[PDB]
Amino acid sequence: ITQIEAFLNPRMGVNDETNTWYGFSEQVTVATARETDRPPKEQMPYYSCARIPLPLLNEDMTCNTLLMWEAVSVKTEVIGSNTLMNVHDYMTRTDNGVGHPVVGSTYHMFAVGGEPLDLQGIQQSHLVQYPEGLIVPKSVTDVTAKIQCLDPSAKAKLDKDGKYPIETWSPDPSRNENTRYFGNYYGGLTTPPVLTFTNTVTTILLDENGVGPLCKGDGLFLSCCDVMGWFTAGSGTHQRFRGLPRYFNVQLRKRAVR
Amino acid sequence: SITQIEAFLNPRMGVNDETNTWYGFSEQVTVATARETDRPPKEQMPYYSCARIPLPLLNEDMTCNTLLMWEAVSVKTEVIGSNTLMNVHDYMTRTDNGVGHPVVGSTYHMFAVGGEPLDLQGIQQSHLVQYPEGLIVPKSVTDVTAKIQCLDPSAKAKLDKDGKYPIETWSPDPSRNENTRYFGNYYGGLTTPPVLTFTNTVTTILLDENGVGPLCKGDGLFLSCCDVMGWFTAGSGTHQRFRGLPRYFNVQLRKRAVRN
Amino acid sequence: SITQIEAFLNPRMGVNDETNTWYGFSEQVTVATARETDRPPKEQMPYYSCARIPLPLLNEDMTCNTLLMWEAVSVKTEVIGSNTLMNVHDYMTRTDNGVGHPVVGSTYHMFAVGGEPLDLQGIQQSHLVQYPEGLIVPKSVTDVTAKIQCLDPSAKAKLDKDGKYPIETWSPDPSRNENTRYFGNYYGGLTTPPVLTFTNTVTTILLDENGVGPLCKGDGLFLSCCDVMGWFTAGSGTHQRFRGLPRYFNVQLRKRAVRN
Amino acid sequence: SITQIEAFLNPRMGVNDETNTWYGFSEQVTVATARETDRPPKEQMPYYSCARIPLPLLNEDMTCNTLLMWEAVSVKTEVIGSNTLMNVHDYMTRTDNGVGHPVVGSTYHMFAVGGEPLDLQGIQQSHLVQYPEGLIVPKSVTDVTAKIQCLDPSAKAKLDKDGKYPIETWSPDPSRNENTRYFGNYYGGLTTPPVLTFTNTVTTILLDENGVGPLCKGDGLFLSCCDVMGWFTAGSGTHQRFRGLPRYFNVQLRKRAVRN
Amino acid sequence: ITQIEAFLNPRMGVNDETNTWYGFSEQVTVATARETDRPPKEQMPYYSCARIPLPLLNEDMTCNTLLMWEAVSVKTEVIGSNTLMNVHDYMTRTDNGVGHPVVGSTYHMFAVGGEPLDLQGIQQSHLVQYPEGLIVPKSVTDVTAKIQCLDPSAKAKLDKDGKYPIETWSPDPSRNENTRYFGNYYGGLTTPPVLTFTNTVTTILLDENGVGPLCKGDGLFLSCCDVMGWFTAGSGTHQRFRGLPRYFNVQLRKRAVRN
Ligand SMILES: CC(=O)N[C@H]1[C@H]([C@H](O)[C@H](O)CO)O[C@@](O[C@@H]2[C@@H](O)[C@H](O)O[C@H](CO)[C@@H]2O)(C(=O)O)C[C@@H]1O
Ligand SMILES: CC(=O)N[C@H]1[C@H]([C@H](O)[C@H](O)CO)O[C@@](O[C@@H]2[C@@H](O)[C@H](O)O[C@H](CO)[C@@H]2O)(C(=O)O)C[C@@H]1O
Ligand SMILES: CC(=O)N[C@H]1[C@H]([C@H](O)[C@H](O)CO)O[C@@](O[C@@H]2[C@@H](O)[C@H](O)O[C@H](CO)[C@@H]2O)(C(=O)O)C[C@@H]1O
Ligand SMILES: CC(=O)N[C@H]1[C@H]([C@H](O)[C@H](O)CO)O[C@@](O)(C(=O)O)C[C@@H]1O
Ligand SMILES: CC(=O)N[C@H]1[C@H]([C@H](O)[C@H](O)CO)O[C@@](O)(C(=O)O)C[C@@H]1O
């Protein structure tokens, strides 16, 4: 059993660790028309991803029998729920009451994979104009009204950290044979966030046949996104997405393959 | 041994045409000004999705007293695109400089895997609704009285047309569907937040009490679903639209011998 | 040998007449102006549904010291018609150009399968209510005092008439019902969203801790339920109506020898 | 092997007199105008319910170094009367011509089965409350200081009087209760909807980790509970009353040999 | 099979048992600017922690084989949910209605370990100016915008009661090999609190290899925080954190180890 640890930082829009709003989005702006809907880069949450390099197993990749790393299980943890207990920051308040803590829509997902997470493109609006330096369904097909449902042409891989927006991309259930993904979504404008944390819980990654993800290229592929909802600064009614970092501890073993 | 079949079924929220700019939503919902004048346009209601997937022919010769049928053993299913509701920059209602108000309200989730069409039982919130011609509704199969507000045993149909059987008039019939497995949940309210989980690690077993999965008559696999996520509100108004999401099915099939 | 019995029980929400245009609803709920003049009309309250299903006669002679009884071993039950609550185009209250306000409020779900009528315990929110002629209420079996607001052990009855025992005055008696299995849940509030799951894949075992299911006295299967989904609000005003839904039962029975 | 004991415990919501017209409720709750003049009348607070059920004498001679004790091995418990909260026609607050506002607010549920009185730990929201004469409160057993707002280890008592130990000053003591099993849940809020499940099909095992149930000292079985459902608001005003419900217990016991 | 039991009092800001607001914070003040955000120490909740001394097991610590106390299981309980059923105190009310009970954000965590709990620094705002005598990320590292996500340098041990604020410190999932920790968080301004209590539930502390926390220096390390939400006195709209005490009953055995 080989243990691999990693923390993936949230990519909430302010993805630069020198910027004072790191781990939040920039203030979210809202379209004045369907056809003029143009969100800046910094105002949308992204999938976080990392390829962790694994020890080289085959001193010759020509042999018809090889060793590949198998992900057998994962302990994962969203850290920092405790930060949202801060209600003395410069936040909206009612009379002399506490600062209004982060609330709204929540999006939790992690994936452990032997290759990049397969993504399927889908959108709330076909008419959105995404900025430059983002991978969105437009990058791979003709975005029509079909993208508001299932357009089987809208396929991609999560290979760039902080560049694939959650709002255009779902884990593709029709692929991801070599990846396990898990997520949940809870909507609403002001819904309270919920989180549980413990170091006592292991997720088994073996499939129906006892085969974990197999790490192509001696690469272990971690993906996630942990939106806690919106923060509101005491400066106004403008809101920012707030995300938290995710810990991964993956257990691997060597598996012989043809 | 095990044959994998997969399919995506797209939502039928009333804008059922993939050329239309509001595909995957209803048209703006209108409300009756009287019980007796209640006439929903067909583009303003959500429908059951359904697809008959053709399977490989198993029997060269149908004279044979022993034949093979495809047996649905398990299904991995997945409502895709909960992530799209994290879009709050679209042209939506907002409070001051706050984010766009996301999709909220009543949720209706249902899926079925069968070896024939899903059996439906007619039931309505109002017996006085006038449905457009071209929809299959309780009127289509029996005389509609007040009885339809409860259980009218004569109001039986089969889900045999995609995007034409409205959810508001049809429930899966639990007194039939011997050769289908169905699963659903409903959460009401006007502004209830939507909830969804997704994973590719979860298999639902379709074998009945006797270890028999759905058996695919005519070498067809019958998939059906509806996935209403609630109501969208465009920043043009207070008019609301149903929002649905597509559903993946990956059904595990094996060959089952049957006496002919 | 497993014999199957299936039945639908229609809700008794107050409009218990299948010819009435508000069947499956209550009449408009009125509210007392004083604790001492609290007089609810029969049509304004939800009732327990119940039905005795006749079973095949088993014993040609009842003198015999060994007899067969039908034993209920399991049940598949389903509340039908959650899909009807996805109708928001009816003549209903609305906010601006938004959808009709769907059914919301207090929910009460219960089902029972027994070999005799459900045992009831009388209990009331107010001892001063004056119930109308035609209903079976604690006053029918005992002297009603303030004790009826807690547990009055005199307030005993059997659920032997469909749509005449108001839910508001009768609980399933946990001190009796040796020969019945009952199940239920309650969720209060004025505007709480209703919740429902449905499937044809879930069986409830009726065998007690001794391996014995309900034994059908007089070759009768006793089915009981109530399925209050909340209150409907017509677009004519702020007046509200209870809304209930029908329940399906599929009971698996076997013959069980008994000593007499 | 098994002896069955059954009992109902009525709620002690502050109107603890079965001849009072508000039995099963509190009197109208009053609120302090200062921390230092906070004086709740006894009828305005809910209490623990308790009862000792006598059990057959097993030991004719108490000098014997081997004796039998009754061991509680399991319990079926039920909160009765959630159905009564479906009454929305009583003289209750209402919005326009809507139904009466049903019971909502904070819920506190607890039950305990023990071979002696339940051990209580004193703890308070305010150390400055002045409790009326005739109640057992932390003041009865120790010096009440600000320590009582957290854990004051000197604030120890035994639930030995029905309707006299206010729930707001007393927790089940997890440092004692070796010879008791207790279970509870709390759900706060001013207007939270109440939730209840009921069934006669569920048994809770009372055996500890070493397979030992409560052992009935003095051949008594000690039942305790509290079942606050929230607040009732009469149509007379905005004054509220605690509303509680009775709890049924059915305890299974066996004889166990012990060493004196 | 040895039994340890302890009550840990909450450290909600009024950490002083002589103070009339023991078990609550002082009234919470809110920053008027990101850069002047200075929380007085009495207005934040802290981790509670204690070290329970255990019997000495080894005469000679030089030996290559020794006995350590092993934590196999714990019964834990938050006490005092019943106190929140008091709606007659001097509290906000609507008309002649009951006092508004404690509502808002809840934070529950407990930990049982063979050494102090490992903490990872993380903040909602890198710009907060923490008062004197608290241990906060800046106490151990260079605080920058990195502290708003995961800064690997922000590492500490929960070694002082009522001095590590919950809003700066998460249990570190990358350490705590010799600790089990459990927690849950539920946000919102007015969310109803929820609590279950029973004496019938045991949590197993053995890891995947069947080993519990092993008590270094014959000390058992208990950590917790139990914030129930905010109280609002009838004097105004000013709020106080409200916390509750936590009971621990830890079962220990002797385990032989290779030194
Ligand atoms: C549950 C109850 O007591 N209902 C009353 C009802 C309501 O109080 C009222 O409709 C408000 O919702 O009042 C009823 O009519 C009454 C007459 O019988 C009486 O002569 O005059 C009363 C005037 O206060 C009152 O209108 C009704 O609507 O049916 C009687 C019913 O029992
Ligand atoms: C919990 C508490 O202290 N209750 C008080 C109560 C309330 O403060 C009041 O009803 C508002 O809800 O006040 C009581 O009556 C008091 C008199 O005894 C006193 O002489 O004058 C007071 C006026 O400032 C007040 O009316 C009451 O209603 O019973 C006493 C109770 O302890
Ligand atoms: C968390 C924080 O920054 N708290 C401030 C506090 C609050 O901003 C204020 O009470 C609103 O809730 O302000 C404190 O006092 C301040 C003075 O130090 C200053 O001279 O003037 C300030 C306003 O301009 C304010 O009065 C306080 O109330 O304790 C200080 C605290 O850090
Ligand atoms: C999603 C979207 O279309 N955003 C646009 C916003 C908003 O319309 C307004 O800020 C109202 O929130 O306007 C801009 O001028 C801006 O501030 O950058 C352009 C930006 O593209
Ligand atoms: C469900 C229903 O009856 N809708 C009817 C609507 C609504 O009453 C109004 O638009 C108010 O919402 O009125 C129409 O003229 C319309 O707009 O198409 C006819 C339609 O039959």
Automatic annotation (TrEMBL), chain E:
Keyword check for Cell membrane: no
Family: Belongs to the polyomaviruses coat protein VP1 family.
Function recorded in the entry: Forms an icosahedral capsid with a T=7 symmetry.
Name of the protein in its database record: Capsid protein VP1
Molecular function via GO: structural molecule activity
Disulfide bond is among the record's keywords: yes
Parent-protein start and end of this portion: 42 to 300 of 364
Subcellular location: Host nucleus; Virion
Record's GO cellular component terms: host cell nucleus; T=7 icosahedral viral capsid
Record text on subunit structure and interactions: Homomultimer; disulfide-linked. The virus capsid is composed of 72 icosahedral units, each one composed of five disulfide-linked copies of VP1. Interacts with minor capsid proteins VP2 and VP3.
The entry's keywords: Capsid protein, Disulfide bond, Host nucleus, Host-virus interaction, Late protein, Phosphoprotein, T=7 icosahedral capsid protein, Viral attachment to host cell, Viral penetration into host cytoplasm, Virion, Virus endocytosis by host, Virus entry into host cell
GO biological process, one term: endocytosis involved in viral entry into host cell
